[PDB]
């Protein structure tokens, strides 16, 4: 992930969209907290009918 | 991917047909992503034969 993401600085992507199941979407957002890019500038749309089922 | 790196080719369409798989689709996407690639990837293989021409 930490490659993943770092190859998404380059293009310094501020827009994802997600496509994934209910624990990869667990998954990815931790790894997103503990590389701390939830902060504001950045957005996500996670594509998926179980958005308020996340633990968001 | 290799005759690719040969051209040093940057921007192209991808034409394909579902029918081999999406592998290569994946490849060429997964390459494209770190050689700052812009694919333009269409499925021409969905097309019905009754008017394959208009499209």
Known sequence: YRSLFQDLELKKER????????????DIVDQVITIGKHVKGYHYIIANLGFTDGDL | LSLIEYYQWDKFAYLYDSDRGLSTLQAVLDSAAEKKWQVTAINVGNINNDKKDET
Do not use: F, G
């Open chain 1, 15 to 26: 827009r994802v969209i997600l496509d994934c199941e209910r624990d990869k979407v667990n």
